[model samples]
Target: PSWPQILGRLTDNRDLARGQAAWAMDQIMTGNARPAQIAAFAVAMTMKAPTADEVGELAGVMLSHAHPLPADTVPDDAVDVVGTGGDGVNTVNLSTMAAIVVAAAGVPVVKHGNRAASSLSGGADTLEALGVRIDLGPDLVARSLAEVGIGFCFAPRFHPSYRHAAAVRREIGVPTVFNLLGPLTNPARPRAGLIGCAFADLAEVMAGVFAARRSSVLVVHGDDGLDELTTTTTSTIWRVAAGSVDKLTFDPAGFGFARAQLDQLAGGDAQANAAAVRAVLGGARGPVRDAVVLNAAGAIVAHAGLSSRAEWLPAWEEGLRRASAAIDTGAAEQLLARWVRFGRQI
Candidate 1:
């Protein structure tokens, strides 16, 4: 169907069926649609509340358009941690902090992100401020992954196809499915990871996206609207593994973490966020450390194969302990320094 046909169906709130959503997304992302149709499609599809499966289909289209990592560069078990990032709060870059800890904890991380769009400092922004380069090509990223056990996939560098919608998305001036698309569109396509969505409903949608690729992933969303496994409130987690979807709740206190208020996790611009990262990695402890450790626990559980959902809490507990050690003993800090050095190489 053409742009008008697709927009008509969405405007009527008629959900595009399975592969139909994919076609619509492919068309829009192909840069062939009018700006009006592109904007209308984004507004309508999100307002219409597509099913998890439908969103997954749309994610598949985005992935098809994404550029890939170097062949055989990233290992089979490399993990990613990313967030949708429209939580309306400026938390420290928890996902990036956690990803570095994961790398220190012995898992390869192919992290993906861009400069800030809806938050104070996006992954790329904070990483850049922390002294790591963000504009590397896939080959250079592969080198980082090979040398440092982690690599940052700067979105603009890896997903050039997104350029078509960047200006349109900017003009719309609100979060759209593209927010949801980021976590699902990792060009490295790692098989195990943790993805956080600000809107809770999209957690299952993201899980479905990874499930389609037969991946093992934990999709998390905080009940308090944080795009992470929060210490402030309950978080919903959808576990997608072995072609099965399991739903669970994560409460920081239940796993023996001290409960924290949302504001306690608040972070500022890139410099502030970068300082927080260094503080946490340098053996400081508090809301930032606890929160970062929890997410690192989430990544560890996903990457280290913690078995079924029933065993998750204790696994997270153990992961929390391990991540704490990784940071406190300067392993994470060392890893960060190596990555920063790697980035400065060019």
Candidate 2:
């Protein structure tokens, strides 16, 4: 696509804005567009306000160019727990720890993530700080998932084409379509996921995209501006399954958790974040544990397709108990240790 053509279409305000954004991404990824051209496209898309289909198409283009995990690597029921991290809360990586908890609860996890976008620590950063390898090749990643029940696919390793756009993104100095694309383009292609959207409106859009891809997905956004479920306040959720979507409200107290302040959940550097993770999984009780349990329970419910509060309540409660046990009994820590050891062996 020509740069002028792409820019013109992006600024046109037409029904084909979705296709235009996808094509712009293709040009950006393929090195067909200059940094300035790409930046213009990103800015235009941002100003124009991309529709759900536009974001979905761009995400599809990203996934199409990524190096996916082996087709048979993860089980059919495996889940990916990830968030659009630009929410700026800088909380300890709850989804990463929650993935570990979900694994210990006997649900497989294909956790796809990247380095910190706006936070002090990303999933890969924390995992590496905890001695879990972050650069495993595809085969070892698959092995990790099969044997350890959880695997982390660092985003850059799978999406090499992103390099072409990275410099442009930084130079642009603000979030654009790229922030919305990352959470939607898990290379492992797990059919079930608990995805966190940076904005509440994005929750429904992301849910619709995932549903279009035939995924059982739960997209969440904290009403207080965090991406993950926050005990600080209620969160809005869009549950997408079987081609339909429903909105649900998430209150921590409803799930037996007390309200937690955002400051209590703030994280520092990778080392600090890693230590915080250890503390939570080592049975330290507080807001962090409460938040992890809340998100992990949602992952369990999403993976097992336990719809309805009646069906979800018992399972969510049980999931919380199991997750807490996994942390307290040292099972969750042991899994991290095993993954670290496995990474060393490879």
Candidate 3:
């Protein structure tokens, strides 16, 4: 329970030195160390940048405790779409809505999320607002995955290791390493992941971290500091696990997207967001429509096991139309309705 001696190892200035520091920080997050010690450690680590190894090693702690998502949870290969949300950007549940679109297009999506911290509503909050009871038993969660191609590991439930940090996080009332760690520590442990960060700078560091941790990932952050694939501005990205680290930029115009102002896409509340999501699924066309399509396309290419992005891009974009069809024909709405009923029982 005491990590007094381990702190010294983090003081070194060498490659993987931050990994040592991150490893120590994980212990603190998981209750292996005292609260006071963790507070001090977090501050020190913040002042000093974490090494690649440090980020990877830090993630190892959650990997050890995470409830391994059922084998072939998402076909032979699948992608978990998540984001490190502390951006203070209040947008509709873009990613959550995109997951529905992906699911409608026959791609499996396992989204991991928790309550709102920086935003007005997190994934779970959005779902709950839409009337689906969460925190179901593990078996029920698995059933949701099998039947709907969409499962959610409500963060507070699956990551039991965070119990200790709960009070600290609440008391601190500010962002910390735990917020950054959430997406990386997904309980499902999907082979392929598409995670987002609020800051573009984190793309390289986080993507490399996932690659080191042995994940095929597409880490993205928009120029406006938005985590999702944004039409508002050019997005910077880092691709890892699949290949070498490369900085990439993309614009909505290149994808044939009309520039969408933030106000146009804004949701009045979770209900309003849910309504927008429902409308998009119902085949409503507009900025919300295109935004959901491209975002889902990236996730589809990342998760589906049909070679690479080159192969999937065209088809994936086309698949959005198919998803829209599912919505218009009522198939998408029916599937989600079934999941909601089942989720409540669970």
Candidate 4:
């Protein structure tokens, strides 16, 4: 239970038991540790590269300390699209695009995010740029979901108890436990999600947790280092179900999406990202639209926890067609407009 002892063991390449990690995280989350201790613990954990159980305990501790949104915030069936941000690719906000399209298709959504990191515009940033209020009370957030079928939970508001590490976390200036925990610790604890990881290791780590917890969230990572399903090449998906993990290789071409160059997916700042979302949702067509539809389809796949070899591709195709229709019909754009107005008023 000693913070120094736990970190010291980590320094010796010893991973913590779930209890040890939980107790240490309890200290950090409750502001019971000094900044120096917090920094050392975070850096040590990062250097050691936590195992799935380690990250799970850390994330579970974080959730224990979070102010979760109302359980009924989005319907029990709502899906969340979230990703770890260390992919280093400056692509458009594909996750948010998927959320819009999926929400438009009648599956409710609640996005979890922080401000910009690993890119010029994070989901919260793009939403803000598009004239939506990224910061709002939980009550107002619920209203956004109830009316527009999509909502967002800004991490800072949801985790005030975990805010004690912010200054030290900022000074450290690297992706730490705090950075990777967002996707795993969604306060809403959404039952389904299209979650992305920067690499296979993190995917496994996250996959193990979801499997252990029996949360049907799919974890994905691109072979080319994308934190999303790539239209450019093969990607890996870790399908997690109750006490089980299944790995699958994904090829966009199988779904009839031709390969796209990463360069074509390039987007600029928040404004550019917002513009890209608008371009796809507003009926402009290109690689960006293809990419958005793929991730959006992935959302439905995750939501339904589809894993049958025979059913997977057909399900993906259905999701892809549904996502495409959502945008092609202008429902995605109209949904964005409604939420933007609703968010600002709230």
Candidate 5:
């Protein structure tokens, strides 16, 4: 589809908007959209402030193009823990660390991610720093998921077609629809996930998108400017399940966590984030470890179909204890070491 045609469709609130947006992303993913064209398309979409249907369609198209895991390899309860990044907080890789904890706790995890785009370290970066091979092919990744309760689907490796737009995204120098597309396009297509959005408005919008897909997903944005749930401040959360959406506020206090300062969770480069991951899973206690437990508890609840704090609080409390046990009992660390060893063998 031509850029002008896409712009024309977006200008009007027509049903064609969905198909047009999908077509444009297909072009970009297929390397048909040049950098200038991609940049212009991105700017136009940003200016248009995409509708929920539009965003959902674009993401669906991207997922359709991704190299998905074998259907049999993914368990019924598998879930993803990821974020849209670009939050500018650079906190420790809480979600990634939480994925490790979640996996160790017995829920299957298909963690999708990439290197840092707007922060010093992204999921893949931190995993690489931790010595887990991050560039395995789809088959090996699926094998990892089957053998280990968790697998890392590095974005570029699974969505190779999207690489054509990477340099264009960088040249554009800002968040685009592509940024929103990543978390929604998990290669494993997990039935549920914890998705952190950079802004409240976007989280609300994405909740509609997630609901439209009939997926059980929790979309969160910390009031303190964090994409993931933070101990520093309350988070506005949107729970999407059974094609319905609900909104709620997540207070750390309700979960028995006292407010912790954001700076106390600030993260540095990949190595630093990796070190923090080691520390938390190595059974260190404090804000950082508490944060990982909190995030992992949320994932466990969402995957277990608890959409509210009221419904999930007791379960989350138990999940918190289990998450902590994963670390305190050395299960979390052993899982990480096993993943690293398995990846190296591949």
Candidate 6:
């Protein structure tokens, strides 16, 4: 099949600016495209920033090609939280921890994640550390929803298309335009997302892509460059929903956290990252836990559809307080134990 007009524009390497555009398109459409074609497209896309049309096209294709699973038992109040985690921050699993905190509050979460790519511990590793069955089939995911009100998408299972690019991504050992595509390609097609990215410029573009695909997403990037909401630093956020985009900015102090040293959020390895995750979720009661709660609250605020930033603080603060409760009551440990293995408790 001949390439679409978007591809033609992407190939217009007058300056290879089109390379970025084409790369984004390929990221979306190549899930079903032939391998050789995908290889060429990936190489080309790295040359320039992808155009919005290309990104939107790929998002559309992914949404269309996605073989959605049955999560009907999930409450209508559920949400999915994730990040395009090439952030390299090595922080605790904020998104995963936030998911549990949110779940404890009666919101279902279908967190989609994989093993560590750029960071020391991605959601999959941390959850593995905690003990939730990462390899759960679709029915198991539904069971999680029915019981705990939280489901984990191990990525490999729901998006089989990852198999097509896994080898290439591993060989390159660097994030291409595809890194930006992960959070956008939720196989379950959840109604909302709390997706963080490292790049500021991509916020609006990514937000449009989410809006195009009709997902209510709050795409965030820390001003200090962390991908997940780090109460550790100032951050800028792009909120996309109802077919519009809005930008919001603030630092962790506003949430009442003592301005944390960015280093406090750092993790040594997956084991250390897992330790940090436990410490935070276990209510370790410091910068890390505070940060996690802040993120969990942000997710709740996002999921609850709070209209203003002010309305969100209370929800998030409640989430933080509950973060401590979830940890103290052994709820967090139970969640970790339920999802992960015997020895590696997070």
Clashes of each: 0, 0, 3, 0, 0, 12
lDDT of 6: 0.67
Off by over 4 Å in 5: 9-16, 162-167, 306-310
lDDT per residue (tens digit) for residues 1-346 in model 6:
2445434654776333334444545454555465555655666665556556666655555555555667475555567888877776777777777788777766668777788877767788777765557877677677767766777877777664643676666666566665567777776667677888876666667887776755666788888888877765688878776666778886768766787777877766567766777766655777777777777766766675533343456756766676557667877667656544422332
Regions of candidate 1 where Cα sits further than 4 Å from its true position = 162-167, 306-314
> Relative to the true structure, how large is the alpha-carbon lDDT of every model?
0.83, 0.81, 0.68, 0.83, 0.83, 0.67
Positional deviation of residue 65's Cα in model 5 after best superposition, in angstroms: 1.2
List candidate 3 stretches off by more than 4 Å: 1-19, 70-74, 162-167, 241-243, 304-329
List, residue by residue over 27-95, the lDDT tens digit for candidate 4. 877768888888888788777766888888889988887776666565777788989877888789889
Off by over 4 Å in 6: 1-8, 11-36, 162-173, 306-325, 328-330, 337-346
lDDT of 5 at 206: 83
Give a tens-digit lDDT track for model 3, residues 1-346: 1355555544553333334555675666565776666666665555556555556666676657767655655554556778887666787777887777667667666777887776767777888877766675456666787887778888767866553576666666567654577667777666666677886555577777776656666688878777887888888767564555656786758657788877666655667777877787777888877777767766765664335444434644665566566666776677678778877665
TM-score of 5: 0.92
Q: How accurate is candidate 3 locally (lDDT)?
A: 0.68
Quote the positional error of residue 145 for candidate 3 in Å. 1.1
List all candidate RMSDs to the true structure: 2.0, 2.2, 2.9, 1.9, 2.5, 4.3
Q: Arrange candidates by TM-score, highest first: which order?
A: 4, 1, 2, 5, 3, 6
The alpha-carbon lDDT assigned to residue 195 of candidate 2 equals 87
lDDT string for model 2 (1-346, tens) is 5667767766676545346667778877777777778777777766665567887888888899988777778788989899987787888999998999989888899988878877888888999899998988788889999988899888778887554465876577788767667778888888888888787666677888887887877888988988887899999888777767878897878766888889998998899989998898888999899899888888887886623333666766877787777888898888988888888888
Q: Report the number of the highest-TM-score candidate.
A: 4
**TM values, all candidates:** 0.94, 0.93, 0.87, 0.95, 0.92, 0.83
